[PDB]
Design a protein around this ligand. Structure first.
Ligand SMILES: [Co+2]
Ligand SMILES: [Co+2]
Ligand SMILES: [Fe+3]
Ligand SMILES: [Fe+3]
Lengths: 314, 314
């Protein structure tokens, strides 16, 4: 009974089944939602999340891993409601999503104190419930590895060493942050196979992606549908190249779809080809059909969506 | 009926009486409190806030202005409970407290959209209640006037122009941020007399303080008891010098006391003289007795604590 599930008994990692490793039922900025609730509609967010999860389940998804944590509006009670309405296996996490500095709370606080928060969520439960965290989520982006970003990385390592839960990262695919996260974590004693370096699908720089995979970590081809980062076709070409080059056992695929997100995200670009529908099921409509008619067999699909998550959580 | 009060009918500004212009019933980081509620005890925070307010009232305080806004954990329902328990006049505000960047919500959003949030709080009410905001709070600190800090400044100007509520600032007394806030606001058409430039009591640089006062704005000698910024005696000397130099009609005094604050704030320094008790009443124990036995008459006290707030909110 290794993996805790929101609203359910824990499961053995071998029973995780077909998994989407990086999806968000909902995201928001905690301070904005607290201060201006008039901007939000929880009933709509709930409806949208339930509908997305149901669609994923209709394609055979058994488990969704949701790396919404501090900074993205994690809400374990909202999550448990979606579980009750759908029956999905849902893995919640702990961690901190920042790009530059920690909240003012953390002034004069140690890396140990930060890790203690993560361990609290893993061992005791999230937000005053008995729903426990099954992984740690950390981030770095365009600002790089700042002092406070590094603190969070080292705290995640402590949590992994104490509880053995894996680590999912957010990185910027064009500035070495993913490579740096992997290096810092492994220097702290984290098993490379317990790390998913996120958002590498945002680049077609295959040498960079392979470098991280070759160092032992999973590679997150995890933003299918977000053309602003990289178009689906380019992603598909990169995914296919990696598969034919033998990297199936390191590849993890997801959409990073946010059923609701409060970010402005408002600047449209129209290409010759119709824009694909970003959702939690685009890979079933586009990517997986594309791979199969390019000779990718069922065993590859099982490796990516079943065996790799199983290993990650083992 | 100019000034809205939490949990009460609005009052005419002439009836504000003896006012503490900058105190916090409670402060916290919204994201930390949402994610790790185990760190907090609302019952203790409530008890502490009620006790502080009652002590202030025993010294004749009629009105407390609380500039807790987004980023500091504003909670209008907590505030209204404290009002019900004490009978204080409490002025709540709107605004955004940041030093560098806005929350991710604000990506791709306009200054107008930001101002709309402030105007919502002023005209419609705070956090889904009919308690309206009576001023706007903005901040800048060691990072200076960043792009996002400037956005918030300009949004506050829009809110002031539309609703006539005054503006309270947080500044860093040693890096010209206060002067910059004043200049940017006045360039946008804000009356200088509708601005309180905060935290100027943190410096003994009297020329800098006078420069801001001379440009028409109130000067915040507003952190009595926070010796880490400037010891009470040095503050008292600066306050006295300003009074004897004729700046009573620009001076505003407060403690910036946070009945509870979640910041680490953990690094003690011990001086030869016993550390004064930082609270919402230290000025009644130390500062005001000090001024009086230095020849400062009752009319000065009335100017600072009654006439100046009256003007500010008129
Ligand atoms: Co991410
Ligand atoms: Co301040
Ligand atoms: Fe994500
Ligand atoms: Fe303050």
């Amino acid at each position: 009974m290794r993996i805790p599930l929101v609203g359910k008994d824990s499961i053995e990692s071998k029973d995780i089944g077909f998994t989407l490793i990086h999806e968000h039922l909902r995201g928001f900025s905690e301070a904005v939602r607290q201060q201006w609730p008039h901007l939000y509609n929880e009933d709509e967010e709930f409806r949208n999340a339930v509908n997305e999860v149901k669609r994923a389940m209709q394609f055979g998804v058994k488990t969704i891993v949701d790396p919404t944590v501090m900074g993205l509006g994690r809400d374990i009670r909202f999550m448990e409601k979606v579980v009750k309405a759908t029956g999905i296996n849902l893995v919640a996490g702990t961690g901190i999503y920042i790009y530059i500095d920690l909240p003012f709370y953390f002034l004069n606080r140690s890396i140990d104190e930060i890790a203690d928060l993560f361990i609290h969520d893993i061992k005791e439960g999230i937000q005053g419930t008995l729903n426990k965290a099954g992984f740690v989520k950390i981030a770095a982006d365009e600002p790089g590895i700042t002092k406070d970003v590094e603190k969070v990385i080292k705290a995640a390592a402590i949590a992994n060493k104490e509880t053995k839960v894996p680590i999912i990262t957010h990185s910027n695919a064009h500035n070495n942050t993913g490579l740096e996260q992997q290096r810092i974590l492994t220097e702290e004693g984290v098993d490379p196979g317990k790390i998913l370096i996120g958002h590498l699908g945002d680049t077609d720089n295959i040498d960079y992606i392979k470098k991280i995979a070759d160092k032992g970590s999973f590679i997150g081809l995890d933003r299918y549908g977000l053309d602003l980062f990289l178009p689906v076709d380019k992603r598909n070409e990169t995914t296919l190249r990696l598969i034919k080059d033998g990297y199936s056992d390191k590849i993890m695929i997801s959409h990073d779809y946010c059923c609701t997100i409060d970010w402005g995200t408002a600047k449209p670009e129209y290409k010759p080809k119709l824009a694909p529908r970003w959702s939690t099921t685009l890979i079933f409509e586009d990517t997986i059909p594309f791979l199969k008619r390019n000779g990718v067999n069922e065993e590859v699909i099982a490796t990516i969506f079943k065996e790799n998550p199983k290993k990650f959580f083992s």
